[PDB]
Structures are given as structure tokens and as C-alpha cells.
Design a protein around this ligand. Structure first.
Ligand SMILES: NC(=[NH2+])NCCC[C@H](N)C(=O)O
Ligand SMILES: O=C(O)CCC(=O)C(=O)O
Ligand SMILES: [Fe+3]
Length: 327
């Protein structure tokens, strides 16, 4: 095999991890509180050793687009109905699973949120919101969520995007694609490495997607490269919807157009069943979500998600209130 690295917890490992998260949910008032934010990486050292070994070695592999952990138990009855909105989605039934995601994430890096996304929460919610079916945000449904680097507009975007599937009864697939190196000619590749492209911020950073900097990003975007790093294993920064060539740059336009078609043709599906966790490498792969028909009956697809950077100090310029919410 697969383009991702997969780990399946044994029942005993899964019980121990869940018990750990339960303990944290008893001792800490909230997942995004400063106390648990600082303690979670240390508490994570108590997770099962086989899981910690996987996370430590897999993060260092050069190939995988995602780290996938399967087999966390989720009791639908204890979980309760899927919320109608992210504002009210911190339900007691989902609380321990949110702490669990935080613990797993603490093995990979430093977690943060965005002041302009779900009220600057660190653990956020992905669920279908009635009326937002044909939008370009993660609460869409009937409209396929086009592939994208998470927060491509920003130089402080996550290195990893964590997704915990609380329920996915219809098996809706997350979509993934890597750099199509096997099909890019060297000239096209060279152009993609140059600062000849524009990236606007996606709609989830707009004021209409929050309760009661981003402006200058979609209005006066600075030219940026789509590919960086090693020619033979580039890092990727693109958004299928919000990317564009520099004004009048027909050679960059042709390179982006080619890249769109190659990623479209190489997109593959990863189904996160209930309890599955995925950490998507936001530098090697773009990700999206297949279109699906929302239910609105209380059992809709529901994910918790979290942004992870290897170095919070790389984003010092963007620290808003504290270091864990970027502006
Ligand atoms: N090309 C795009 N649709 N980009 C935006 C992706 C959705 C974004 N990850 C969100 O949480 O809403
Ligand atoms: O809907 C999914 O499975 C992924 C959503 C997504 O792209 C995100 O919020 O990072
Ligand atoms: Fe995304």
C-alpha cells in the first residue's frame, strides 16, 4: 503493498490505549487546555510499546503518504448521535476519543489550531452540516472534496493531518495522491519547482465558517513553488481548487494543468472505518474526500481532526494568543 504504512492494534493494545485516554479525560478538563497540551506528549510515552515503535520508525520512512492505525474500539451507543454542527460536537461520548487522538498525535509532533478555524480549537470536527453539502469545506458531502495540501496558502501549514474516524457507516473514502513523479517530464518538473504559482486560502478560514491575515492571503497572494526539496522525492504544496499560475505565465499554467490531470488520474481511496486513525503526510500527499449522500439522522460520518507540526517555533511569526493557535 500500500502507499501508506499501516498498524493494527491488538485488542489488548487497543484497550490499554483507550484506558489511558479515559484516565486523561478524568484528570484534564479539556483536550485543548494548556495543561493537557503540554502533558500529552509525555503521557503518550505510556502507550503500548509496539505502537510507539511503529510511530517512531514509520515517521522516518521516506515513502509512506500516511500512517494508519486501525482497531480502536468505538461504541456507537456510548458515542451518541453525530452532532449537527462542530460548535456542539464536544459531546461526552466523543471526549475520550478526542484525548486518544491527542495522545497519538503527541508521538508525531506539536499540535496547533488556527484562530480562523472552528474557534481556534486544536481538536476539530469533520461532519456534514445541513445546507453546506455543496461547499468546499470538510463539512461538505454531496460535492466531492477536491484534493489539496492542507492549508496550502500558509507557510505554517501542518506537517501531518490527523484524522480519527468516530463513525463512517457507509464507508466514505478519504482520497490521497502523491507526486506523480513517474509521469512528469524534467522540464515540467523544473517549472513546478519555481515560484510561479498562487495559492489562496480555502473557505474554512473565512468568517462565515466561524462563530461570532486571511484577507491579504486571497487578495495579494505572493508567488510560490508547488514542489520543493529533492527532485527525486519532492514535497508538494497545491490545492486543486485554489491554485493558479502566476498572472499571464502560460508555461506555469501548462505545468499546473498537467499536474492536475496526473493527480486526478492517480488519486486513490483510503476508507477510515470506525476507530481508524490516519496521519496524512501533508508534504508528500494531497488528500480529499469522495462525494457522499448525508443522512442527517444522527449517524452521519464523523471525524475528529488535528494539525501537527514537527516544530512549533517555525510558526513563531504567526502565534496568535498562545503558541498553539496560529493567525
Ligand atoms: N480544494 C479545497 N476544497 N480545499 C479546502 C479543503 C477543505 C478544508 N480541509 C476544510 O477543512 O474545510
Ligand atoms: O473528509 C475527510 O475524510 C478529510 C477531510 C479533509 O480534507 C480535512 O479536513 O483535512
Ligand atoms: Fe483536508
Amino acid at each position: 503493498v500500500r502507499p501508506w504504512s499501516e498498524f493494527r492494534l491488538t485488542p489488548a493494545e487497543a484497550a490499554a490505549a483507550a484506558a489511558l485516554a479515559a484516565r486523561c479525560a478524568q484528570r484534564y478538563d479539556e483536550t485543548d487546555g494548556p495543561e493537557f497540551l503540554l502533558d500529552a506528549p509525555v503521557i503518550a510515552h505510556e502507550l503500548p510499546r509496539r505502537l510507539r515503535t511503529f510511530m517512531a520508525r514509520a515517521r522516518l520512512d521516506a515513502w509512506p503518504h500516511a500512517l494508519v492505525v486501525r482497531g480502536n474500539p468505538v461504541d456507537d451507543a456510548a458515542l451518541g448521535s453525530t452532532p449537527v454542527h462542530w460548535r456542539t460536537a464536544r459531546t461526552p461520548g466523543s471526549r475520550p476519543l478526542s484525548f486518544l487522538l491527542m495522545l497519538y498525535a503527541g508521538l508525531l509532533g506539536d499540535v496547533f489550531g488556527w484562530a480562523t478555524q472552528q474557534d481556534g480549537r486544536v481538536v476539530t470536527d469533520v461532519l456534514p452540516i445541513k445546507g453546506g453539502e455543496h461547499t468546499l469545506v470538510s463539512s461538505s458531502s454531496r460535492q466531492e472534496l477536491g484534493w489539496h495540501t492542507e492549508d496550502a496558502f500558509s507557510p505554517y501549514r501542518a506537517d501531518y493531518v490527523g484524522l480519527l474516524s468516530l463513525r463512517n457507516p457507509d464507508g466514505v473514502a478519504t482520497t490521497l495522491a502523491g507526486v506523480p513523479l513517474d509521469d512528469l517530464d524534467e522540464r515540467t518538473l523544473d517549472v513546478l519547482f519555481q515560484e510561479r504559482f498562487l495559492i489562496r486560502p480555502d473557505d474554512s478560514h473565512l468568517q462565515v465558517n466561524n462563530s461570532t491575515g486571511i484577507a491579504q492571503a486571497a487578495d495579494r497572494p505572493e508567488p510560490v513553488a508547488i514542489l520543493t526539496g529533492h527532485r527525486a522525492a519532492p514535497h508538494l504544496r497545491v490545492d486543486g481548487d485554489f491554485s493558479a499560475p502566476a498572472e499571464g505565465d502560460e508555461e506555469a499554467a501548462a505545468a499546473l494543468g498537467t499536474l492536475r490531470k496526473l493527480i486526478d488520474a492517480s488519486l486513490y481511496e483510503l476508507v477510515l472505518d470506525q476507530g481508524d486513525v490516519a496521519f496524512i503526510d501533508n508534504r508528500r500527499a494531497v488528500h480529499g474526500r469522495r462525494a457522499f449522500q448525508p443522512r442527517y439522522d444522527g449517524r452521519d460520518r464523523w471525524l475528529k481532526r488535528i494539525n501537527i507540526t514537527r516544530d512549533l517555533h517555525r510558526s513563531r511569526k504567526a502565534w496568535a494568543g498562545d503558541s498553539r493557535v496560529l493567525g
